[PDB]
């Protein structure tokens, strides 16, 4: 069934989701940051990227930002620059530089009237996760079902503690990543196909990475599988909790078959690996700790015995409860 299921998580996923009032003002925003970027370049360009640009945006969301540019212009006096002009119009927050990486992290703001905790991060010319957003901006359009799995996902494990890659879990990112490979290797019928591995797909090259996939969208077939959300959720759940086996095997978008192991990657941290579909050096769940994968794993089990427990009535709810 998961009739009740289902309507319980598009109840969830209405109140979770960024309401259309924050996304204007998160828009606002950036168009404010724009005027002072033009201020210091006039040929540079501020993308959005991540979770708002994709629609995979909880309430209370956080931007990301990119600044893009010319390759041959250094990107930390221009980041130097941009910051100045920030600090004197009214935004407050830091300046850093790890490695070659210059980075601006925006904390409040103070006149322009976008929140007193506004926070925001700036990148330069950090190309490939405009891509990585492409990848699951084109997933989202592909599939209505995606966007409230994700949410509630994500929820999810922010309720359970298990969303804290600083604290020896794992990323947002991360669980999008296992969604997708999830709705993509996993569920039988697919409910996505493999858009970097499709016959269209065109070889597109960015900083040393392939970030090429099929992008024509509106010559894909709908999917073949009629699940409705909450059994989606249920599958998923069950996948990590009794299935997946994450001491020998990585979540891959680079096997027809979604098949690999740690070995062939050279993968012995590594407790918990998800092999970035672009960045296929980065393992997304390199923050998971032994402990961490424990929680994780104890989590993915307990929301799969609460969906298929037998007291009635299920108590849905304590799927969203503080551990
Ligand atoms: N977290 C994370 N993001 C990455 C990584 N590599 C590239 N990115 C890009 O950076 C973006 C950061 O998004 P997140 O902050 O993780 O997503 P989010 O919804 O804002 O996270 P929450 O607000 O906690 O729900 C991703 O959408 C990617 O496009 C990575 O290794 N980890
Ligand atoms: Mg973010």
Redesign the pocket.
Same mark, same amino acid.
């Given at each position: 069934s998961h009739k009740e299921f289902t309507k319980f998580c598009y109840e969830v996923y209405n109140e979770i989701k960024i309401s259309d009032k924050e996304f204007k003002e998160k828009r606002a925003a950036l168009d404010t940051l724009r005027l002072c970027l033009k201020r210091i370049s006039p040929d540079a360009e501020l993308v959005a990227? =991540?979770?708002?640009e994709?629609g995979? *945006? @909880?309430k209370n !969301?956080?931007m990301?930002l990119c600044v893009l540019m010319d390759s041959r212009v250094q990107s930390d006096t221009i980041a130097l620059q941009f910051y100045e002009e920030l600090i004197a119009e009214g935004f407050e927050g830091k300046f850093l530089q790890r490695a070659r990486i210059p980075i601006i992290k925006l904390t409040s703001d103070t006149k322009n009237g976008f929140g007193a905790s506004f926070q925001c991060d700036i990148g330069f010319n950090n190309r490939? *996760?405009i891509h &990585?957003?492409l990848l @699951?901006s084109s997933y989202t359009k592909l599939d209505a079902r995606l966007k409230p799995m994700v949410l509630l996902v994500?929820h999810w494990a922010?309720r359970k503690q298990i &969303?804290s890659?600083y604290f020896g879990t794992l !990323?947002?990112? =991360?669980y +999008?990543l296992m969604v997708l490979y999830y709705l993509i290797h996993v569920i039988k019928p697919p409910v996505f196909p493999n858009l970097l591995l499709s016959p269209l797909k065109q070889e597109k090259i960015v900083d040393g990475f392939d970030v090429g996939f099929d992008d024509k969208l509106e010559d894909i077939p709908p999917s073949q599988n009629y699940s409705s959300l909450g059994s989606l959720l249920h599958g998923f759940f069950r996948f990590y909790a009794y299935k997946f086996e994450p001491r020998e095997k990585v979540v891959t978008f680079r096997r027809p078959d979604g098949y690999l192991t740690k070995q062939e990657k050279g993968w012995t941290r590594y407790i918990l690996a998800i092999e970035?579909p672009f960045?296929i050096s980065?393992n +997304?769940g390199r923050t998971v700790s032994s402990s961490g994968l424990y929680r994780i794993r104890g989590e993915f089990m307990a929301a799969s015995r609460l969906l298929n427990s037998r007291s009635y009535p299920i108590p849905y709810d304590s799927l969203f409860e503080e551990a």
């Open positions: 990227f =991540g979770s708002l994709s995979l *945006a @909880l !969301s956080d990301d490939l *996760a &990585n957003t @699951l994500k922010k &969303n890659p !990323s947002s990112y =991360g +999008v970035d960045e980065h +997304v």
